[PDB]
Amino acid sequence: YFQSDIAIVDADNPADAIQQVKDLRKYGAKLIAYKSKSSEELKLALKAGADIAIVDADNPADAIQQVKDLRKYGAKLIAYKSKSSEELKLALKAGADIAIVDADNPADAIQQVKDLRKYGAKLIAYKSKSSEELKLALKAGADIAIVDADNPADAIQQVKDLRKYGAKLIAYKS
């Protein structure tokens, strides 16, 4: 939370969210991201002191509505995650700031990064337990490296490795 630029919360309920935000906010974390399938929960998280609202909606119609609800509410940093680069572009066209690439497949995921970079996406994020795959995503034009290690030791080493490589924005999921 010191070496990382962004702290990502899942917390499975609102009251956990406003508590987990308050924990991070007072003690360590700089930028706080919160993910939810509920735009109303995301609004509460932002009010509680989160910086980045990650829209988690599985269907494009719901995603566009949620991005627009958060844009009107005054959200400053809206992110959307999809396995579809078409759907990520829909979220950018609705006013999302951050496209999070989430293809199940390193070849495919790295191509989504190139396609989003070609498209002109301002901020692309990429998640991996492979620090070497995160370096390939950054060369391909990703801006945010999301560490996804299976334990604390591997997470701490991924952050160190990506700093030395030159990663400007590193995110960690608690």
Author numbering: -3 to 170
Sentences from the paper on this structure:
Here, we investigate the capability of a deep neural network model to automate design of sequences onto protein backbones, having learned directly from crystal structure data and without any human-specified priors. To assess whether the model could perform sequence design for de novo structures, we tested our method on a Rosetta-generated four-fold symmetric de novo TIM-barrel backbone, a (βαβα)4 topology consisting of an eight-stranded barrel surrounded by eight alpha helices. We had the model fully redesign 50 four-fold symmetric sequences for the backbone and selected 8 designs for further characterization based on ranking by the model PLL and other metrics (see “Methods” section), using no information about previously confirmed sequences. Of these 8 designs, 4 are cooperatively folded proteins, as indicated by circular dichroism (CD) wavelength scans and by the presence of clear two-state transitions in thermal melt curves.
In the structure, we see that the C-terminal His tag for F2C interacts with the surface of the beta-barrel, which might also contribute to the dislodging of the C-terminal helix, although 3 of the 4 symmetric subunits are folded as expected. To elucidate this, we crystallized the protein with an N-terminal His-TEV tag (F2N, 1.58 Å resolution).
